[PDB]
Amino acid sequence: KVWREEKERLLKMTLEERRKEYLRDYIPLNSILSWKEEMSLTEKVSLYRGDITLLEVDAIVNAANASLLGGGGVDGCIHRAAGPCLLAECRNLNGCDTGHAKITCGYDLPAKYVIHTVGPIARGHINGSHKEDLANCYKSSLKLVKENNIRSVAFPCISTGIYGFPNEPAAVIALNTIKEWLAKNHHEVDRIIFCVFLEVDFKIYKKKMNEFFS
């Protein structure tokens, strides 16, 4: 396929059209409970343990590397699930800086768009620069959400695992950045989903959601 043509074709389609073609089973957005439903901004956030590539949302966020060509963790899962047009569109973007984001079509994903953001790498202790770059990943991703009329978006645990950002301080920055953005922009979205894969991340976000959104 030619990514520009496949992109034009997919972005015209309704969910009813897209569902007829889906490769895999999918998770409809109305099957994802709000934090409030699970118990005011509690209606605009979700905590979801599972596979971000199954989510039928306007955008999923990829914890990408500077090349944007794919890799391991959720990045590799997103490339396999989207198919080779995602790598082709990513190639054309010529990389992405730490704390910045770029948007592509989702191709074979149920997600309409992928927002690729490059988390900071902490080989040692997290420092002021790592902390501001991780915040900027969330902010640069949310700027693309607003600019592209994305009403549902799912975030993974950016910079955790091999990039070495400890899971608890990472969650605090993620939750803090989404809360300040929603305070100003809550009208622009129906749902921000924190899509965690690991139990350690689930347990951390579960304890914090009320502190931030209640």
Side-chain angles (χ1 to χ4, degrees):
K1 264 158 282 187
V2 184
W3 70 259
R4 289 184 192 75
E5 294 187 342
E6 183 68 358
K7 175 168 191 190
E8 284 182 4
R9 189 184 75 80
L10 287 169
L11 292 180
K12 289 197 237 282
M13 300 175 66
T14 65
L15 289 181
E16 291 82 10
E17 296 179 71
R18 283 293 319 275
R19 285 159 178 188
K20 292 184 182 183
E21 302 181 332
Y22 285 167
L23 309 201
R24 307 153 75 204
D25 277 16
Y26 71 97
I27 307 286
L29 173 56
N30 67 352
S31 76
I32 308 161
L33 300 186
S34 74
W35 191 242
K36 182 174 204 199
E37 278 163 345
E38 199 94 61
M39 306 292 100
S40 189
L41 290 187
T42 53
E43 300 181 351
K44 302 288 195 170
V45 297
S46 295
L47 174 57
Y48 183 73
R49 188 168 170 197
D51 182 356
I52 197 172
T53 68
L54 302 182
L55 299 182
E56 188 186 59
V57 289
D58 282 348
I60 63 173
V61 175
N62 183 19
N65 69 70
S67 78
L68 292 188
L69 303 188
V74 173
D75 192 6
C77 294
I78 286 171
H79 279 270
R80 277 186 303 279
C85 289
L86 185 67
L87 167 62
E89 186 176 1
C90 283
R91 280 202 173 110
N92 187 246
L93 290 181
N94 191 27
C96 187
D97 292 346
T98 306
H100 294 244
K102 296 188 170 176
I103 190 164
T104 69
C105 182
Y107 300 105
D108 297 338
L109 294 166
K112 182 165 279 179
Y113 300 105
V114 177
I115 297 173
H116 307 257
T117 191
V118 180
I121 304 171
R123 289 169 179 94
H125 208 289
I126 57 169
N127 67 27
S129 176
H130 300 135
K131 290 165 189 182
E132 76 171 20
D133 286 346
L134 183 60
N136 288 341
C137 287
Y138 287 100
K139 291 175 192 182
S140 58
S141 295
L142 289 169
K143 185 154 178 286
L144 292 176
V145 166
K146 162 152 50 165
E147 289 179 352
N148 293 273
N149 298 111
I150 287 161
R151 299 208 51 97
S152 54
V153 54
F155 287 94
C157 297
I158 298 164
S159 287
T160 63
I162 61 169
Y163 275 21
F165 212 116
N167 304 71
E168 218 159 281
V172 169
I173 288 155
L175 291 164
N176 199 78
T177 305
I178 273 55
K179 168 167 198 176
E180 292 190 15
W181 187 86
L182 277 173
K184 197 169 188 293
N185 292 282
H186 63 260
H187 267 285
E188 305 311 329
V189 300
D190 303 313
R191 203 65 66 75
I192 298 174
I193 303 153
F194 297 99
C195 189
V196 307
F197 176 53
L198 290 176
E199 184 155 25
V200 59
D201 292 313
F202 180 73
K203 274 180 149 79
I204 287 159
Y205 275 79
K206 195 187 168 199
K207 289 158 45 58
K208 288 170 185 308
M209 297 291 291
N210 263 306
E211 289 176 44
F212 284 93
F213 302 116
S214 188

